[PDB]
Amino acid sequence: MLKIIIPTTMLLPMTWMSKHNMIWINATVHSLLISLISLSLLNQLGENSLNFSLTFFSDSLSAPLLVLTTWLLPLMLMASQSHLSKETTTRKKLYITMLILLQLFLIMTFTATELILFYILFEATLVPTLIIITRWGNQTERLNAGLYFLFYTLAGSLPLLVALVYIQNTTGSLNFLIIHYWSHPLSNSWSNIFMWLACIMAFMVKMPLYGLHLWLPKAHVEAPIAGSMVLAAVLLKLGGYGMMRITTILNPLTNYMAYPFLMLSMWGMIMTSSICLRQTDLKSLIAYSSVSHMALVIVAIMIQTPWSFMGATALMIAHGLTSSMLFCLANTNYERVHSRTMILARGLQTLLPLMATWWLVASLTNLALPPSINLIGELFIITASFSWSNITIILMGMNMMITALYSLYMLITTQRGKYTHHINNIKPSFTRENALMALHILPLLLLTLNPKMILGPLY
Amino acid sequence: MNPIIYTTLIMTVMSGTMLVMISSHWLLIWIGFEMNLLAMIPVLMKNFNPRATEAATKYFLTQATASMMLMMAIIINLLYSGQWTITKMFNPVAMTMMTMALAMKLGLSPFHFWVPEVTQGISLQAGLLLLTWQKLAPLSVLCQISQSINPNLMLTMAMLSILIGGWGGLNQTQLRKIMAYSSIAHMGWMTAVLPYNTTMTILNLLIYITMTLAMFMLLIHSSATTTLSLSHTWNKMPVITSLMMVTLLSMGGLPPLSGFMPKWMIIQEMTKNESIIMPTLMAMTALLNLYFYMRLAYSSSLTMFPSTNNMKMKWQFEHTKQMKLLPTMIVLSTLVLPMTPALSSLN
Amino acid sequence: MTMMSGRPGRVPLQFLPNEARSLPPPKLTDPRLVYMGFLGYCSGLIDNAIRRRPVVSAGLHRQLLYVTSFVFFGYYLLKRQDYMYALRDHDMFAYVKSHPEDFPEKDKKTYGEILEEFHPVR
Amino acid sequence: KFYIREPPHGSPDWLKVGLTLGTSVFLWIYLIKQHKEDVLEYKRRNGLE
Amino acid sequence: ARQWQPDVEWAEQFGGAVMYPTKETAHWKPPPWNDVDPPKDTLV
Amino acid sequence: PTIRLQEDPDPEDENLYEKNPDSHGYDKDPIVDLWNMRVVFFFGFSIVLVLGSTFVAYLPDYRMQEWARREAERLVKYREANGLPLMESNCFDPNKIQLPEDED
Amino acid sequence: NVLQIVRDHWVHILVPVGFVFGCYLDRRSDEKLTAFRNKSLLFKRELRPNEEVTWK
Amino acid sequence: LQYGPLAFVLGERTTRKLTETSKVITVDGNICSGKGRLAREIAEKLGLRHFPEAGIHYADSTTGDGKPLDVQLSGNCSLEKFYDDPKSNDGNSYRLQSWLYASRLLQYADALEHLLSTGQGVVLERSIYSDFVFLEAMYRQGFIRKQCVEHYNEVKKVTACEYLPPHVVVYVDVPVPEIQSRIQKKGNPHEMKITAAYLQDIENAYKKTFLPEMSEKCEVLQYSAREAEDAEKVVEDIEYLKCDKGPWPDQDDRTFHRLRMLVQNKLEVLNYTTIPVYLPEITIGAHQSDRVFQKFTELPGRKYSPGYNEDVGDKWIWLK
Amino acid sequence: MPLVYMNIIMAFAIALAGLLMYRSHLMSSLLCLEGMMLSLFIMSTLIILNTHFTLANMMPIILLVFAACEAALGLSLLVMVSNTYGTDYVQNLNLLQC
Ligand SMILES: CCCCCCCCCCCCCCCCC[C@@H](O)O[C@H](CO[C@H](O)CCCCCCCCCCCCCCC)COP(=O)(O)OCC[N+](C)(C)C
Ligand SMILES: CCCCCCCCCCCCCCCCC[C@@H](O)O[C@H](CO[C@H](O)CCCCCCCCCCCCCCC)COP(=O)(O)OCC[N+](C)(C)C
Numbered sequence A: 001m002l003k004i005i006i007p008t009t010m011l012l013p014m015t016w017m018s019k020h021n022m023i024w025i026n027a028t029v030h031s032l033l034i035s036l037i038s039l040s041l042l043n044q045l046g047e048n049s050l051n052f053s054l055t056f057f058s059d060s061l062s063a064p065l066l067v068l069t070t071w072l073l074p075l076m077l078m079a080s081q082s083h084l085s086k087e088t089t090t091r092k093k094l095y096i097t098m099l100i101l102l103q104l105f106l107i108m109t110f111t112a113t114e115l116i117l118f119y120i121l122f123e124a125t126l127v128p129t130l131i132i133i134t135r136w137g138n139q140t141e142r143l144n145a146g147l148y149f150l151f152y153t154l155a156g157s158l159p160l161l162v163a164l165v166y167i168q169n170t171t172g173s174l175n176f177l178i179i180h181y182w183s184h185p186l187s188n189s190w191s192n193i194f195m196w197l198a199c200i201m202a203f204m205v206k207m208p209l210y211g212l213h214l215w216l217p218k219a220h221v222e223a224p225i226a227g228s229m230v231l232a233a234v235l236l237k238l239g240g241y242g243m244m245r246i247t248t249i250l251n252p253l254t255n256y257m258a259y260p261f262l263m264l265s266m267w268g269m270i271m272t273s274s275i276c277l278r279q280t281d282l283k284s285l286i287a288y289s290s291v292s293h294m295a296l297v298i299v300a301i302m303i304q305t306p307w308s309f310m311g312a313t314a315l316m317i318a319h320g321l322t323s324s325m326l327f328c329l330a331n332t333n334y335e336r337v338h339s340r341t342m343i344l345a346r347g348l349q350t351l352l353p354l355m356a357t358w359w360l361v362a363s364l365t366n367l368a369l370p371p372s373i374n375l376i377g378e379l380f381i382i383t384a385s386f387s388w389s390n391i392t393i394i395l396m397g398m399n400m401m402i403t404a405l406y407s408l409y410m411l412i413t414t415q416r417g418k419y420t421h422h423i424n425n426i427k428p429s430f431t432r433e434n435a436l437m438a439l440h441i442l443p444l445l446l447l448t449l450n451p452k453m454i455l456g457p458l459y
Numbered sequence B: 001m002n003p004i005i006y007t008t009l010i011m012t013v014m015s016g017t018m019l020v021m022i023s024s025h026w027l028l029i030w031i032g033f034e035m036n037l038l039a040m041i042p043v044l045m046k047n048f049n050p051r052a053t054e055a056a057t058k059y060f061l062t063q064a065t066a067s068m069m070l071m072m073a074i075i076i077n078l079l080y081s082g083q084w085t086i087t088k089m090f091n092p093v094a095m096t097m098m099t100m101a102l103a104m105k106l107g108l109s110p111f112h113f114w115v116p117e118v119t120q121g122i123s124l125q126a127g128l129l130l131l132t133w134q135k136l137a138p139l140s141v142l143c144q145i146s147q148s149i150n151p152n153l154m155l156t157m158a159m160l161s162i163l164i165g166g167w168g169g170l171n172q173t174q175l176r177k178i179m180a181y182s183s184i185a186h187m188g189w190m191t192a193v194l195p196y197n198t199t200m201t202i203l204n205l206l207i208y209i210t211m212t213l214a215m216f217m218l219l220i221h222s223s224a225t226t227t228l229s230l231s232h233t234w235n236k237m238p239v240i241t242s243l244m245m246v247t248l249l250s251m252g253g254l255p256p257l258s259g260f261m262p263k264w265m266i267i268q269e270m271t272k273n274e275s276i277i278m279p280t281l282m283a284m285t286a287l288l289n290l291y292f293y294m295r296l297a298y299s300s301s302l303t304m305f306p307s308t309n310n311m312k313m314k315w316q317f318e319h320t321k322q323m324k325l326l327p328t329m330i331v332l333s334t335l336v337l338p339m340t341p342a343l344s345s346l347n
Numbered sequence C: 001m002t003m004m005s006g007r008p009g010r011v012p013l014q015f016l017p018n019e020a021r022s023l024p025p026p027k028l029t030d031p032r033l034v035y036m037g038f039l040g041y042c043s044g045l046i047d048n049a050i051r052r053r054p055v056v057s058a059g060l061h062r063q064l065l066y067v068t069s070f071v072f073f074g075y076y077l078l079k080r081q082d083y084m085y086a087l088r089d090h091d092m093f094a095y096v097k098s099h100p101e102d103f104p105e106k107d108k109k110t111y112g113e114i115l116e117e118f119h120p121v122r
Numbered sequence D: 001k002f003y004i005r006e007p008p009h010g011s012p013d014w015l016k017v018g019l020t021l022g023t024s025v026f027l028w029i030y031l032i033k034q035h036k037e038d039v040l041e042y043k044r045r046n047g048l049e
Numbered sequence E: 001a002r003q004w005q006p007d008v009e010w011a012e013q014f015g016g017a018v019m020y021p022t023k024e025t026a027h028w029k030p031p032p033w034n035d036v037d038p039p040k041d042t043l044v
Numbered sequence F: 001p002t003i004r005l006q007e008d009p010d011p012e013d014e015n016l017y018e019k020n021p022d023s024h025g026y027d028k029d030p031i032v033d034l035w036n037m038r039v040v041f042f043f044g045f046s047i048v049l050v051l052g053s054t055f056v057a058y059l060p061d062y063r064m065q066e067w068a069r070r071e072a073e074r075l076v077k078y079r080e081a082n083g084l085p086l087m088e089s090n091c092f093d094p095n096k097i098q099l100p101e102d103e104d
Numbered sequence G: 001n002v003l004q005i006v007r008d009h010w011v012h013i014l015v016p017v018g019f020v021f022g023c024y025l026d027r028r029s030d031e032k033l034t035a036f037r038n039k040s041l042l043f044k045r046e047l048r049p050n051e052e053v054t055w056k
Numbered sequence H: 001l002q003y004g005p006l007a008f009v010l011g012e013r014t015t016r017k018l019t020e021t022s023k024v025i026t027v028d029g030n031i032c033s034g035k036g037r038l039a040r041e042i043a044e045k046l047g048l049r050h051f052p053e054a055g056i057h058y059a060d061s062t063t064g065d066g067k068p069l070d071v072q073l074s075g076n077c078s079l080e081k082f083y084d085d086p087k088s089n090d091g092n093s094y095r096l097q098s099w100l101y102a103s104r105l106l107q108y109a110d111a112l113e114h115l116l117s118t119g120q121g122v123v124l125e126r127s128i129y130s131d132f133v134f135l136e137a138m139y140r141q142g143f144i145r146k147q148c149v150e151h152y153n154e155v156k157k158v159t160a161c162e163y164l165p166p167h168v169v170v171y172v173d174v175p176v177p178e179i180q181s182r183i184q185k186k187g188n189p190h191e192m193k194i195t196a197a198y199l200q201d202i203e204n205a206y207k208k209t210f211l212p213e214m215s216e217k218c219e220v221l222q223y224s225a226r227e228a229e230d231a232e233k234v235v236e237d238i239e240y241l242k243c244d245k246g247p248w249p250d251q252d253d254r255t256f257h258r259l260r261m262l263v264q265n266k267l268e269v270l271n272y273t274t275i276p277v278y279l280p281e282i283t284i285g286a287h288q289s290d291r292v293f294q295k296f297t298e299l300p301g302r303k304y305s306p307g308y309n310e311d312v313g314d315k316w317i318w319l320k
Numbered sequence I: 001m002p003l004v005y006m007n008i009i010m011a012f013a014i015a016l017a018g019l020l021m022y023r024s025h026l027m028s029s030l031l032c033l034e035g036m037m038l039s040l041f042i043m044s045t046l047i048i049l050n051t052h053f054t055l056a057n058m059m060p061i062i063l064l065v066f067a068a069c070e071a072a073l074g075l076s077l078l079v080m081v082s083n084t085y086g087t088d089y090v091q092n093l094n095l096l097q098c
């Protein structure tokens, strides 16, 4: 596993000793090479995980997430260099350093064998994101956003830490293999109920669960483009992955402790999809769409079935790619017109045809068109939910409708109609932007040919 | 003050602390405290002004009352057992009086009122000394009598100190009062784990001292005592504000920084004693300290405040006096979490 | 609250007892020593940055002294920490050996003969 | 170029540089010798070689 | 198009003697720039 | 002064196409821009996508799916050649299970 | 002619050397976990007349 | 060994270097008076070090190379356009006044450092003590606001209290019509725009605040325009003065040690000039501040500390 | 314990209450501090005489010595306070807040 970690660490002195006009080229090339190397973790076993050492291990759940992280770094670098051109050399290197440190923390987080190490890296991911949002965000709200991003996370994660150390006092270990092999049922007691809540609520906040989600619209809207890309594509999944690891010690308590969270997820999925229908800010719409998809992921993890776990893994990967692409698409128009109001710039298909094609494909994957992996995950989760209770289809189907209704709505508002007359500074699409869209969209489509590679351990 | 006289007074303060920490006789510990206070009063008034005089008077009144209570507790303990050795107090009333006297000396709630005012009234070097070196002697005495302390009283004072430190720090624009409230909260954290493990108390003391030394040295380097004065430092020394922001993040306890290691070690220790509610409340309350650290970082390094024209002149001059241990202090305040097991060397 | 300060036969301020010489010394390529040297290097770089000197190039002798001091202290720190952990385990094993009635060896059952409650997921 | 004293001139303070390098070299030699003696004493006490 | 940075109106929020001024505390004044208060004309 | 502060006016964003009509949107310097485009295209589209997709497509069957199919074929052949049931409701042999003796 | 291009392009070997060093450290870490090499009830095997270990 | 507490403990004292000729001397006067000639002649006769009047680029002459920097990186104010449009809405008048006060504070610190380190006397034209007269004129002509005066008074109160005023204050008196005739004679197109009210306000400020206040703690030598050329007479008058009035006799080795620790370390001297009082005339926004600071750091010898800039020929940087 | 021990302990408690409950004058508080020192001297002397512990016959004297130091220290501070305000009133010490 060090064959991934050490090159990522070497990215830091490489960017700090590069020429002033070579930082982007070097960082992009070497992050792409690191992604190519990380692509070898996809060879998984079935029976058990790849246990490299006492500290790091790779699973069929971890490997797609690691590949997505390593692939997302070069895309973030490509998307950042446009609006950071006027920046000084030192601050550009500091921005790249924040991105590299975030990738390093995420890579170590997804492969830690022991739950305290996972928790420490899980919290360590906070600091670079906070610095990125509050230093390179554009508006005055970013500061408030940063605070919301911070104290929502910590207020959830501080109890988890306590629970974790408590567990190691009674079990004797926090190694995940030992935890899984020596797992014992949780009795029906108040102490067990509160330990369950302490083990779950941090990942709930990270998802975010409906009702604990107010930090996400602020943080994703106010962040720079690379911040939004990493926040939506990878950071949210830190919750899901965490849940998939920690529910192994929460049975059979989850059989009834999950009812309020399931109700919140289903109803708030309806609520956030409906919120997307009346949204004036284009980034806010994408953020709320992420909330709805993550609610579906929460339902999948809470019902604890192999089909639901497979669907949750697939949906996590697919949503990461799609939401990153949508954020980049919105940022292109924002850099055109310096406003996030969705109705300001209209009829853009007339002026930017290829970018309109990119918009269309992103909207199609957002509404889960078959046979995309978005629908693969969604359908697996819906089938598992139907087995859990047949009435769930009523909500699930409703969500589907609303999702399409807002997706095309976005597409119709920004691409169709007539162009705004007074906006006359809409330049042709750069090769950088088109390449970024392609590098988002093509892996997503290729994953359809080999879906099992993202279906997780339960496959 | 004459430099020779200043050196003599500093060495007398240090000698009082050493006398406290090497004595086996209660009278010699008391004498060490008296010597420390006697030499400490002029150091607070080195820069003469009404505020320094008021701070020295408040400090002396507090410490002299605490010393009276401490001698009373010693005498009661002697009365109920003809013992002068500092092992374990034989009378519970004497133990309560001794605990209150030591809490008053440390500034734990509800005897915290003097800590901000005095810290505001003195210079930054005097504040550095007051918030780092002055904690060693009472904490050492508390460590020696740890088995005798009543857990309820000590834990009540510790929780109150954490809560009051967070709440009081939330309201401050002056940097010295911010440091004082931070000190009160950290003292509460230190005294919470004392009845369970004194090694954790020592570890927390060392980490807090390192971070406090780093912050005071960074504040002396960029001669700022208010938030708005510190907001000018980015336009003269950006590296200083960056280092200050990282150290502030460490003080808030965020991982993977060093400031996380003490709390992590304390909560865990408390869970070995079936204590869950108190560690949970303690962390959730330390969130307030993190909040006002974050506000200071917002005003100082993460954004750029307006500056003044005369700052241009300051661009032409370097810092005359260099701090030798500031780089080591910053590195120790941030990057020592991977060396956590080394704490076994502290027992 | 004070676990091992009163251990019998303990010299007050040695930092490294004679019996600690029975333990294998840490290797000079120990990853913890390498991290200590990295900390010294970071201290040297920060010293260059604060003094407004070229960060990577300015004081090679000064940076070398930083690294050397950190490594030198870290070696003895690691020796003391390893000795303390060895003492902890030595005392633990001796106490378990001397108190058999407090740590009984009970016959262990196989899983085919332990009745575990089954909880269906549905 | 510069107008005034500028205490660090083109020649660095050779006494201070020599002292710094000598301290580093002495510490390194002492550490190597100490490690060798530690290994020898450990092997002698535990009867490895 | 440039990033927003604090201005004078934003900065003056931090220039008072306290955050969150109340009716009682609004009359509190920030300390002098140097730690020196003007001498009182308390003639003896 | 009817003014609150001495400030630079907000500048207008400059078009990379004005000085470089074929500017690729990577950098102001045309040579750096062209090479940044070239390295992005070569190392993303030529190296990672194509070669990585080929590598993932031909990954060896460590999941042991063909192995499981062959094992199932052998078991089905043997079991229906001798009249045995194709599968048993008991995953473990009851003779190695020790149930509690009395249920009442 | 190569001196200056090396001086401005030597940062291009940092990451490949990092990869090689990481592979070496993975092998070294593997060397510490051989307690059950050729000892599992599932894979235990008689050595070939020439091979010394079943894996490394 | 740089001076400090360690140097004071062993050996160095200040009172042992004073040689009755320390005599910090300031030679004040109105605009266009011949006080500069008199100051230089006094310095030559008495063997003291002369300090030419501190201008906008005074600090530039003490740092790096003595060459003045661009007005945008140093000063950010113009005397020429203060003469052109003293009522400009860009705040140039008070910016110039505050920058000039800071420059005079730096020059006073430099002169005191020289006197306290070598014992040789210094001669100055104006000082932080006589700067305010210009401010007062600026206020009475409607050139600056009352808030600017309040801020100037705050800065002066927290700065000038830390230093010893000059032993000898020399004033050169020239009437306003003669000043106007000399100004017309000089030939400077910008100075010709100075009105008689401005010069009269400067004269009134001097004669009604500065000289009466200096006479309470110093000895004042006034001289007319005609008798100002007799440098020998002025030096003889200076040589027969009894400095028994000010605080200078009331200073011992410890106060001299404090003062000498203050006069070096120019950052400590300039500390309170940039206090966070947000006047529009002197407040500079974040974007302009960042741009100008970067442009300053791009100067050929300003990126690092003085001995560490290899683009101006510094060597052995790797061993420093 | 005898009535005399409780009388001395009551004297200490009264002096401590007098110190903690302020009036205008700082000198009155200094007198309360000195009274606490006197009560401690008397109590320790009584214990040491009663138990015939010969070597602590010197500790009350040393106690007295440090009492003087405190007194001197306090008086010094009082002088400075007076020189600032013309009174020794504790009300004047309100430049510093919490
Ligand atoms: C904005 C979104 C935030 C996230 C929301 C998270 C939701 C968490 C809610 C937790 C769900 C259930 C918690 C505990 C399970 C049962 C709770 C209780 O109501 O059930 C009854 C419990 O009986 C009584 O009702 C006691 C509970 C009533 C007192 C609790 C106060 C509830 C008021 C609502 C407070 C709001 C909570 C959220 C604050 C934000 C069952 O009776 P009984 O089977 O005999 O006892 C079972 C427990 N035993 C086995 C240990 C004995
Ligand atoms: C921020 C990180 C912490 C930094 C701390 C400051 C570092 C500089 C300290 C300089 C080291 C020299 C100190 C000791 C040298 C010899 C003295 C020695 O003999 O003292 C012994 C004591 O040994 C010292 O305690 C060892 C000090 C080592 C501290 C390191 C622990 C740090 C925790 C993990 C973080 C990693 C730090 C990285 C280092 C740079 C005597 O033991 P003993 O008299 O019986 O204990 C008295 C107290 N008791 C009885 C109540 C227990």
Ligand SMILES: CCCCCCCCCCCCCCCCC[C@@H](O)O[C@H](CO[C@H](O)CCCCCCCCCCCCCCC)COP(=O)(O)OCC[N+](C)(C)C
Pocket (backbone or CB within 6 Å): A039, A064, A065, A067, A068, A071, A317, A443, A446, A447, A449, A450, A454, F048, F049, F052, F053, F054, F056, F057, F058
């Ligand atoms: C723009 C111009 C348009 C007009 C021109 C169009 C030209 C034609 C385009 C359409 C081509 C359609 C091709 C349809 C696919 C046919 C081949 C396909 O079936 O290959 C699959 C193989 O696909 C691969 O398995 C999956 C590719 C995975 C790609 C990964 C990309 C690398 C990662 C990039 C970063 C990703 C980050 C996020 C990751 C989570 C089959 O695998 P399988 O039948 O089983 O293999 C059996 C035989 N084997 C085992 C020997 C191979």
Ligand SMILES: CCCCCCCC/C=C\CCCCCCCC(=O)O[C@H](COC(=O)CCCCCCC/C=C/CCCCCCCC)COP(=O)(O)OCCN
Pocket (backbone or CB within 6 Å): A152, A153, A155, A156, A159, A162, A163, A166, A189, A190, A191, A192, A194, A195, A196, A197, A198, A199, A201, A205, A212, B274, B276, B277, B280
């Ligand atoms: C974004 C906001 C998220 C907020 C999350 C807050 C909820 C976190 C869950 C509770 C946190 C603390 C739980 C402690 C960790 C559990 C470990 C444990 O097992 O300890 C229990 C002890 O459990 C407790 O003491 C916990 C009681 C609660 C203390 C703090 C109360 C705070 C408010 C309670 C309700 C809020 C928690 C749920 C909120 C949901 C999210 C909004 C049993 O230990 P023993 O003492 O040995 O007993 C064994 C014999 N029965």
Ligand SMILES: Nc1ncnc2c1ncn2[C@@H]1O[C@H](COP(=O)(O)OP(=O)(O)O)[C@@H](O)[C@H]1O
Pocket (backbone or CB within 6 Å): H030, H031, H032, H033, H034, H035, H036, H053, H079, H097, H100, H131, H134, H191
């Ligand atoms: N503190 C100040 N504020 C504004 N203008 C000043 C100040 N000091 C000097 N000046 C201007 O600088 C010019 C030269 O000063 P001055 O001493 O009067 O002439 P000179 O020294 O050449 O005989 C004059 O036009 C004067 O008005």
